[PDB]
Amino acid sequence: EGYQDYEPEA
Amino acid sequence: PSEEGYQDYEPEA
Amino acid sequence: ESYAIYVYKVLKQVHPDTGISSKAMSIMNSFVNDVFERIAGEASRLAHYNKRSTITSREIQTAVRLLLPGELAKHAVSEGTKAVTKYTSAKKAKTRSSRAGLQFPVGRVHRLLRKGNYAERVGAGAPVYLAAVLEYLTAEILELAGNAARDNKKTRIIPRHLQLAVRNDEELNKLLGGVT
Amino acid sequence: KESYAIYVYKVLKQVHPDTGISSKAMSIMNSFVNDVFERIAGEASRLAHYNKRSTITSREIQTAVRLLLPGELAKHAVSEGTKAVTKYTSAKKAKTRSSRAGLQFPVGRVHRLLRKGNYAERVGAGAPVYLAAVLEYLTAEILELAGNAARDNKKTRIIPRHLQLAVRNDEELNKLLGGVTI
Ligand SMILES: [Cl-]
Ligand SMILES: [Cl-]
Numbered sequence: 001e002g003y004q005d006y007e008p009e010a
Numbered sequence: 011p012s013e014e015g016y017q018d019y020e021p022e023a
Numbered sequence: 024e025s026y027a028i029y030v031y032k033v034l035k036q037v038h039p040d041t042g043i044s045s046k047a048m049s050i051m052n053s054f055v056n057d058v059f060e061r062i063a064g065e066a067s068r069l070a071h072y073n074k075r076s077t078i079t080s081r082e083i084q085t086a087v088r089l090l091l092p093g094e095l096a097k098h099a100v101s102e103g104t105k106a107v108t109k110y111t112s113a114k115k116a117k118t119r120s121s122r123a124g125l126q127f128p129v130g131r132v133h134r135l136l137r138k139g140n141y142a143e144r145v146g147a148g149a150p151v152y153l154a155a156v157l158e159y160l161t162a163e164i165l166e167l168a169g170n171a172a173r174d175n176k177k178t179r180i181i182p183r184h185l186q187l188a189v190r191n192d193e194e195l196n197k198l199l200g201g202v203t
Numbered sequence: 204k205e206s207y208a209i210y211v212y213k214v215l216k217q218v219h220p221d222t223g224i225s226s227k228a229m230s231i232m233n234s235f236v237n238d239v240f241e242r243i244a245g246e247a248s249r250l251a252h253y254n255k256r257s258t259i260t261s262r263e264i265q266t267a268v269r270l271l272l273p274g275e276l277a278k279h280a281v282s283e284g285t286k287a288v289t290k291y292t293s294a295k296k297a298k299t300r301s302s303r304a305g306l307q308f309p310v311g312r313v314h315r316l317l318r319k320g321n322y323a324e325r326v327g328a329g330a331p332v333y334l335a336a337v338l339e340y341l342t343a344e345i346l347e348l349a350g351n352a353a354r355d356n357k358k359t360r361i362i363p364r365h366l367q368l369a370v371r372n373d374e375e376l377n378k379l380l381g382g383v384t385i
Contacts, residue, residue, distance in 0.1 A: 004212045009225030009268045011186050013082045013175070020181065028372055035355070097239075115282060117218075117340070118347050119275045130375060131275030 024135065026055045032126040033161045041181035048184050054164060055157055058200045059135065062153060064085045065145060067141035076143035078136060080107050080152040084128035087156055092197040099156045106155035107148045127154040205316060207236045213307040214342045219350035223360035230365055235345070236338050238383035240316070243267045243334060248322035259322055261288045261329035268337055271382060274377040276344070283340040284333035291332045299328065308335040348373060
């Protein structure tokens with residue numbers, strides 16, 4: 001499925 | 011209470 | 024009791040780029056505490072005339088009309104009434120903040136009314152109304168104090184800004200001039 | 204260990220449509236949801252045991268919520284759970300649809316996890332509806348405040364220190380967070 005994305009930050 | 015001066019000046023600028 | 028977090032939230036609404044010194048925040052806390060105590064004391068006295076030992080928004084409103092001078096009372100009553108109407112609305116809000124439209128938290132005011140043993144029971148509208156009144160007064164004082172700070176070429180509110188702002192407003196001076 | 208991340212994101216877009224969330228902040232959100240789930244389910248299990256009930260229903264979930272959540276948070280959570288169960292409970296049995304509960308959090312997933320945890324012999328259909336609504340409501344509160352903290356910080360995404368600050372400065376959420384961990 002189309003899992004949503006969060007990904008690293010600052 | 012004086013409207014000017016630094017007699018009671020508090021830190022943190 | 025410290026209202027500092029809520030004073031700070033209100034300050035960011037009325038003067039987004041203005042700080043407040045530690046001693047000025049202490050004065051703000053004393054103002055809010057004094058108004059809370061006197062409203063609660065009058066509301067508690069008023070409740071004895073009713074059959075039920077309950078603080079309701081009706082006793083808060085009557086206490087506010089006695090205590091707040093001049094147009095402060097009119098606006099505080101408008102704010103408290105509007106907050107209770109919003110809080111009790113049939114369309115439920117999804118968060119506490121959106122339910123009453125306030126910065127001051129209803130639950131804190133409720134706990135403080137209960138802790139003071141002002142009556143056997145505290146009605147659900149009374150802390151909402153009182154929180155809105157305290158927020159209205161806090162916003163008014165901070166608006167004027169922040170103006171005084173800016174006129175004094177400062178980016179933070181210090182005690183002399185608060186003292187000047189309260190003293191120069193006839194209604195706020197009557198309400199607060201005896202607070203130490 | 205269960206991932207609510209998809210549903211946390213759905214709630215995030217309701218309360219802050221233009222605000223992102225980092226991967227590490229989502230991991231903290233997921234752990235909070237699991238921690239609240241486990242604490243509520245555990246107290247509900249004890250309540251059913253001491254009341255000699257073989258089935259956990261929304262009644263034990265509601266009582267556990269009242270024992271665990273303080274102040275206005277508890278009032279809102281109880282309102283949210285009660286509303287979801289009433290909407291979900293259609294008069295015609297075997298015609299239930301999860302969509303009737305009006306939620307983003309997954310009713311069926313929460314039901315399976317309640318069943319997996321052996322909190323009681325049986326789990327009634329109202330218990331996961333009520334619990335999903337409470338978990339979603341708490342998520343909405345935290346994401347609202349954390350998103351406000353990000354906005355005040357001129358950030359377009361929530362990072363872990365926004366979450367920590369938002370919980371710390373909310374008397375009721377801070378109290379709750381202290382009770383979901385030992
Ligand atoms: Cl009331
Ligand atoms: Cl059930």
